Amino acid sequence: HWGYGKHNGPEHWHKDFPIAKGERQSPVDIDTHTAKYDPSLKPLSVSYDQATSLRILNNGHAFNVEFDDSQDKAVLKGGPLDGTYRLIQFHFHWGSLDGQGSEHTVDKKKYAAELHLVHWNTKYGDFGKAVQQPDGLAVLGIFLKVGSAKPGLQKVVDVLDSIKTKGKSADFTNFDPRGLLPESLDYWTYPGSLTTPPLLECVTWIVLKEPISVSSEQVLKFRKLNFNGEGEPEELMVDNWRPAQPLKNRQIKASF
Ligand SMILES: NS(=O)(=O)c1nnc(NS(=O)(=O)c2cccc(C(=O)OCCCCO[N+](=O)[O-])c2)s1
Ligand SMILES: [Hg+2]
Ligand SMILES: [Zn+2]
């Protein structure tokens, strides 16, 4: 099945998932000089105060931190969004070196990592219904560069021994994602897709401009993670990112 190597990487995905060459695929490069300020954009609202993390899972691609979304607790509203989007999970893509890792790039600049917090539109009742919908998902993208440590990321980092290999999960309750926001909510927004198969074209992207900085020692632990399952050849989980995909004259709008 799909992965990030020579034989199962992003260049092979189109075979099982034709939509991989669709009209609103992700990620894209954000050309800061072509993006336009959008006055019709509402203020963005990220309410993560009542968020309830359940568990952390190595899925053979990333780790997902998973949330109980049976209630209307952690939510994205505002911005390009209409109505309410519920937080279901978060995860990252990172590099083998600090000069690669992000999925979205800024004027072709690659950051060491990118965080995606994934939300479903509550008019659709479940997540599964939402992904049959053009406005089904909202993902909130955040860049990571290597500098001073992010204290709010340290609980994720320390638990990663728990979930070394494909399959493993760890109980992961009371994690606060608020610890992972940068101070500014300035952002670019376009309609796009999941960046992993099935690459469903269901996402309003809200990519934050200000990146968070994490330590060299922090990103280093992500890199110790395994692609393989327990007792298999060691493939370090590095470079689990998709490259920028053709814009196809969508317009990227700026909140600033
Ligand atoms: N990087 S990204 O653009 O944000 C994503 N790339 N992939 C993402 N997946 S997910 O939205 O988060 C997610 C969430 C909760 C449960 C599940 C889940 O366990 O169900 C499988 C989802 C359909 C794929 O399988 N399939 O047979 O079609 C998945 S999000
Ligand atoms: Hg869709
Ligand atoms: Zn992602």
| 3-state secondary structure string across 177-246 | HHHHCCCCCCEEEEEECCCCCCCCCCEEEEEECCCEEECHHHHHHHCCCECCECCCCCCECCCCCCCCCC
Around ligand 1, the residues with Cβ closer than 6 Å are 88-89, 116, 118, 139, 194-196, 198
Exposed, middle or buried: residue 143 (CB in 10 Å: 0-12, 13-18, 19+)? buried
- Give me the CATH topology for the region 1-256: Carbonic Anhydrase II (3.10.200)
Structure determination technique employed: X-ray
Select from 105, 115, 102, 123 the least CA-distant residue to 30. 105
Closest residue by Cα to atom 3, ligand 1, is 194
For residue 151, what are the contacts with CB-CB under 8 A and spacing of at least 6?
A: 179
Per the structure block, which two tokens stand in for 141? Answer: 């993208």
Q: Is 61 a catalytic residue?
A: yes
Nearest by Cα to 133 from 153, 119, 149: 119
